[PDB]
Design a protein around this ligand. Structure first.
Ligand SMILES: CC(=O)N[C@H]1[C@H]([C@H](O)[C@H](O)CO)OC(C(=O)O)=C[C@@H]1O
Length: 370
């Protein structure tokens, strides 16, 4: 009945003059601190998104707790007349450049509208920072350099939401998970499909990798041991959809539904996935958070995959939170206070009226594996 006894559970965002949704969590291994991003809307309704907020949490080792600083708006992260949403932070380990990818949309134009009209008006933006988010650069509209030709082919699109991924490939590449509503039938409605924007020049230029099976929405990616990228996407189907890539994000194959990982009725809900050092045959294991209830968005659960990316390998969940739970984001924080893998979790709680930070170790969530 009781939720999982964690290392830490604290409300990091709450409604007030504004409502806060769509959480993102970035871990700076060298700072030993987290960057918590969220959307600051004038109300819970999507069409009311405005700016992106940020909070820095620095991990204290003596007490194994994370102390967060006052929330601030990533001012530079926005385009004139458009509202910003869907944050997708990434940290380029080598250039030390911190990236924040977001989507800018004109006025309060809805997503439904770009859909019904098959008219895309969504801009792809990013802002960078070299002092860990203290001062951001001026907004840079990537739409043309990242899209262009494929712009008319989509009714709309979006990045993440959630932390992006830098590969440990022969060139440490940037992979930004995303999904788009593609126009494939003159009569039938557009079908969304997950995919990743790739950058091999450290952000200089981009490229869109090929789509995966269709009817997949917001997804996230991870890398595992010969070196592959498993993707996990939100589907309007019974459960979650997941595919793997063996060419650094350019192609996703073996895509299939995973019934062990349920999805709420309508169009499902966003979820998060990360990889981490196996406590002992495979180099990495995966951890994934998503609501475990099947009629609604409640009971946030954590799932383990000790033999990735074998779909049947996925484990049964463990209750991280009882009640209303929605969008979440995960981060591997290294080795915890108890010698096991440390995890940082950010999730939408209490009917979108607060976003919570959760911190726990593998030994806590899945002690069985010991
Ligand atoms: C850009 C945008 O409106 N994103 C919205 C997203 C989207 O509608 C869905 O992924 C299919 O397009 O859904 C949800 C949601 O709580 O289910 C909130 C997001 O704000």
């Amino acid at each position: 009945m009781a939720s999982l006894p964690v290392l830490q559970k604290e409300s990091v965002f709450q409604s007030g003059a504004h409502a806060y949704r769509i959480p993102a969590l970035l871990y700076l291994p060298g700072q030993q601190s987290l960057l918590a991003f969220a959307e600051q809307r004038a109300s819970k309704k999507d069409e009311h998104a405005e700016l992106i907020v940020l909070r820095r949490g620095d991990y204290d080792a003596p007490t194994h707790q994370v102390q967060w600083q006052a929330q601030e708006v990533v001012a530079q992260a926005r385009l004139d007349g458009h509202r910003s949403m869907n944050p997708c932070p990434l940290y380029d380990a080598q250039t030390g450049t911190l990236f924040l990818f977001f989507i800018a949309i004109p006025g309060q134009v809805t997503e439904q509208q770009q859909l019904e009209t098959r008219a895309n008006v969504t801009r792809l933006c990013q802002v960078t920072s070299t002092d860990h988010g203290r001062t951001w650069s001026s907004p840079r509209d990537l739409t043309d350099a990242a899209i262009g030709p494929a712009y008319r082919e989509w009714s709309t699109f979006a990045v993440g939401p959630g932390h992006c991924l830098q590969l440990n490939d022969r060139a440490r590449s940037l992979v930004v998970p995303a999904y788009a509503y593609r126009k494939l039938h003159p009569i039938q409605r557009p079908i969304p499909s997950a995919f990743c924007f790739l950058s091999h020049d450290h952000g200089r230029t981009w490229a869109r990798g090929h789509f995966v099976a269709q009817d997949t929405l917001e997804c996230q990616v991870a890398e595992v041991e010969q070196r592959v990228v498993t993707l996990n996407a939100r589907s309007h189907l019974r459960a979650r959809v997941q595919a793997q890539s063996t060419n650094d994000g350019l192609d996703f194959q073996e895509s299939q539904l995973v019934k062990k990982l349920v999805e709420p009725p309508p169009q499902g809900c966003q979820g998060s996935v990360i990889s981490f050092p196996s406590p002992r045959s495979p180099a990495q294991w995966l951890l994934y958070t998503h609501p475990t209830h099947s009629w609604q968005r409640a009971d946030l659960g954590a799932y383990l995959n000790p033999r990735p990316p074998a779909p049947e390998a996925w484990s049964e969940p463990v209750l991280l939170a009882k009640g209303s739970c929605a969008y979440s984001d995960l981060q591997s924080m290294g080795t915890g206070p108890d010698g096991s893998p440390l995890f940082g979790c950010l999730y939408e709680a209490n009917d979108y009226e607060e976003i919570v930070f959760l911190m726990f170790t593998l030994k806590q969530a899945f002690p069985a594996e010991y």
